[PDB]
Point group: D2
Chain length 136, copies 4
């Protein structure tokens, strides 16, 4: 029974094998721990991009509201100008009538002065027609 000296080598290799299976299990699990630890910063970065995307939506919404408001006010001014411009064309037309009318009135007065000069000659001849008539 020289087996007692052979089996002492049996616990020496089974134990030395198991200690390597646990050192591999220890080493790998440490590597897998820190690898899986990257998940949180990765999630962090996504949340940041997510927030920046929401800012873009916020900003686009403010921009659209701003331009609409600007266009609104811009349209009111356009209408006011248009009303103001129509008012002008009307007053210019009135002034054109008042100018033509003034011309007619001036021509009437010119004609009336001519009528006066005409009827003055008619009076001069009609008066000398009495003075040459009272020559009898």
């Amino acid at each position: 029974a020289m087996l007692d000296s052979m089996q002492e080598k049996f616990a020496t290799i089974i134990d030395s094998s198991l200690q390597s299976v646990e050192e591999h299990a220890k080493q790998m699990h440490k590597k897998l721990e820190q690898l899986g630890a990257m998940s949180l910063p990765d999630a962090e970065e996504l949340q940041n991009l997510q927030e920046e995307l929401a800012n873009e939506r916020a900003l686009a919404q403010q921009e659209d509201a701003l331009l609409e408001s600007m266009m609104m006010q811009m349209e009111q001014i356009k209408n006011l100008r248009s009303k103001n411009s129509i008012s002008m064309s009307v007053h210019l037309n009135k002034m054109e009538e008042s100018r033509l009318t003034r011309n007619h009135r001036i021509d009437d007065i010119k004609s009336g002065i001519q009528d006066y000069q005409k009827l003055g000659i008619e009076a001069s001849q009609s008066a000398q027609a009495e003075l040459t008539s009272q020559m009898e």
Copy 2:
């Protein structure tokens, strides 16, 4: 008295002469002023007519000014028409850019969700592998006992 009647007829021959040269000088002097009277009516009519000439002469410059106001009013509509075209064009283009942005930002959210799936999947796989290391270490130590309990 035949000679006496002849001189009484000389009296009359000068008597009417005293009325003739007196009336001939009255109608000559009265007609000399009616003529000067018409001359004041014609010089006043000329004077006044000149005034009305230069007054009516203002009409054409008045019309020039109105016509200038007319042109400046038409320019204003021109400018108003350019301004409206410009803003319309601008709004047109701004609207495309807005749409392109929205399409681009939506595409982005898709990739962000895509990536979040890829992150969760990655975690499951890491956990799956971690479990396999635990499974190996457990079935490894339990295998050692099955050998040490028989030969020892």
Copy 3:
């Protein structure tokens, strides 16, 4: 003295002449009154054009203030977007580093599994080197 009968015609023409000089003076002055009356509506029309011109100035001033304000706000949004876009490029670069790093860590673990398979064969030969050695 048959002049008393001639002078009665003298007051008849001097009076008839003067009454025509006053009827002309009356008629003309009436014409000149209403002609000069056009001055007030003419002045009115000018004042209206004057007010419409001031409206144009008012309107142009509002328009200039409006566009300036719009441009201001438009510039703030541009800057905010630009800051938001720079922030993105930064997070994308971080994620690219975290991806490369993750690749190195995975390769290390792959290599460490290979080292384990290698040193397992070294153990298998070294163990059978004892079992073929204890054949003596």
Copy 4:
């Protein structure tokens, strides 16, 4: 006892045979498991290596997604650059239209002042003519008296 020693040597000849075929079967059975042990270490190493293969295979799609995010970011700058060019262009043009309007409105005020002068001048001329009618009627009635006071 010569025959007796031969059989005691047969005992030993089977005694060591009882240890030989017992040890030959112990190292054959012990080496038969060290071989199966390495086989579990190599199949686990293969199994795990597969897991790491498909996990590392996620890297390329991850890179594709980042590259898409990169392109969508560059598009956004493109769109931002078009938008700024557009508004600049628009402001440029709006500024000319504004100037042209001011020039046009100032021209107008000049004509309005021009016309107001022409209106005041017109009034002086009307008053001047009215005065001439008064002057004529006054110097006309006073002329009538100078004649009626002498002949009447």
